Amino acid sequence: PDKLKKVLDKLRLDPKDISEAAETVNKVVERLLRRMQKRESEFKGVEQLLVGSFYEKVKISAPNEFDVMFKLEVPRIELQEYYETGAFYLVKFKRIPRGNPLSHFLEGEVLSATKMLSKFRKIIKEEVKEIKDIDVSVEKEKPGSPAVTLLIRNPEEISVDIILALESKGSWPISTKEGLPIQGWLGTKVRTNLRREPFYLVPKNAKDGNSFQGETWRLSFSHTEKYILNNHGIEKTCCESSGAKCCRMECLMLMKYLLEQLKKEFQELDAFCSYHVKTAIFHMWTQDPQDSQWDPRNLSSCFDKLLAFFLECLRTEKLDHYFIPKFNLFSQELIDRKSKEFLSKKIEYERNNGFPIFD
């Protein structure tokens, strides 16, 4: 209780420090954006997913890291499910446009994610080289990442992930039909309105051995996930000025920070990522939908039942993608059986000893 609240103080974003990064992040992102929007650029139609504010780009439990999506509203595309996860797809056009630059990235009828990302990376590398009023560099490509990560230092280093994405305003793929099970929690009108919004595809960028590995795209619901984080209560006034504070976000920050610390010491946890944590708490928020089940006075009790739920996902080797029920993020083919039992052992140790890793 007293220890968990003390850890949250160092994780909470100082509005004075996050504002100083807003000027630098916006300036660099805007410059790269207007570079992509030139006549020669094949990404001339690209736009920013979340525009206006700056907390939409910051990553929780990560004060110096930021995510930005560069979305491209392509013509009417047709999706082809690539293997039976429901998250990965080949992308074709219903009618290939005549003078569109995206045709340069076609491998037959399918749009090549890896070629688009390569040319995406080059245009970014060229523009950041011309940046001399602020030290900006392009980090080496992370395997499996759809993003071109920038390294900005003035004076402390901050990270900006520039994610390439296709925007589709068509209907969400059929694999999501039973996903987003928020009816008892956020309600059916929220779920209907959310599923009227676009969906996004990002390069899988995974050397999986398939013949279409460079043409594979992954479903992204980062916009829907951000909405849920900002609108996480059954009552509309949850965490508002005239409402009651809850500890949902604090439990997520604690769980995310507990995993990232365990990952820095043990390489056996490399297959785990913070998305497993956000997926797990989404299911927890669906299981415990009442705002009173997340009272800030029960912080320790709420953080403990999140750990127990997570350990239950490791034990059963089952963690369905919140938007794609058929996609088990904890299947053997994605995470080894020994890694789950290892993470379970370490979490039980931290849980039983007052979390010594937070010292």
Ligand SMILES: [Zn+2]
């Ligand atoms: Zn709340």
